[PDB]
UniProtKB/Swiss-Prot annotation:
Subunit structure: Interacts with ESR1 and NCOA3 and these interactions are enhanced by estradiol. Interacts with acetylated lysine residues on histone H1.4, H2A, H2B and H3 (in vitro).
Induction: Up-regulated in breast, uterus, colon, ovary, and stomach tumors. Induced in breast cancer cells overexpressing NCOA3 or treated with estrogen. Down-regulated in 5-fluorouracil-resistant derivatives of the colon cancer cell line HCT 116.
Expression sites (tissue/organ): Highly expressed in estrogen receptor positive breast tumors and in osteosarcoma tumors.
Bromo domain mapped to chain residues: 3-114
UniProt-annotated location(s): Nucleus
Protein function: May be a transcriptional coactivator of the nuclear receptor ESR1 required to induce the expression of a subset of estradiol target genes, such as CCND1, MYC and E2F1. May play a role in the recruitment or occupancy of CREBBP at some ESR1 target gene promoters. May be required for histone hyperacetylation. Involved in the estrogen-induced cell proliferation and cell cycle progression of breast cancer cells.
Protein name: ATPase family AAA domain-containing protein 2
Range within the parent protein: 981 to 1108 of 1390
Length: 130
């Protein structure tokens, strides 16, 4: 229905606003763009599904996310890729892990405050009906 297409358009507006607030935070610059194959040729042999905030913006616009749960799976994949690729006691590795945990925690905190639980439940019930 028209009501249902309006629901998904509101979800896209909400997700684009959250994503741009993450992407301007100086701590999260390393998560804003795909890893350059050149600079890190080893990255794609270890990390089987790369994800970054620019790709997330592209996916919103392609209608890839019909719920906030499916959006948060890609934020979780950004964070878990960084934890897996940078696991050592080095200060460089510990700094990126600290930033990756802060990106995940910041995303979940914005959504907990600003998302209405009945709005997400409606998206989940339209998705289940298709
Ligand atoms: O989850 C929301 C969405 C909306 C909002 C937006 C930014 C910051 C806080 C809030 C709290 N509020 C309003 C409207 C909704 C009613 N009680 C929870 C609820």
């Amino acid at each position: 229905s028209m009501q249902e297409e309006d629901t998904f358009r509101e979800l896209r507006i909400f997700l684009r606003n959250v994503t741009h607030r993450l992407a301007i935070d100086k701590r999260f610059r390393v998560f804003t763009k795909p890893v350059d194959p050149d600079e890190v040729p080893d990255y794609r042999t270890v990390i089987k599904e790369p994800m970054d905030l620019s790709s997330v913006i592209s996916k919103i616009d392609l209608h890839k996310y019909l719920t906030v749960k499916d959006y948060l799976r890609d934020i979780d994949l950004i964070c878990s890729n960084a934890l897996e690729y940078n696991p050592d006691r080095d200060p460089g590795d510990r700094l990126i892990r600290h930033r990756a945990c802060a990106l995940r925690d910041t995303a979940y905190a914005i959504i907990k405050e600003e998302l209405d639980e009945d709005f997400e439940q409606l998206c989940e019930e339209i998705q289940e009906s298709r």
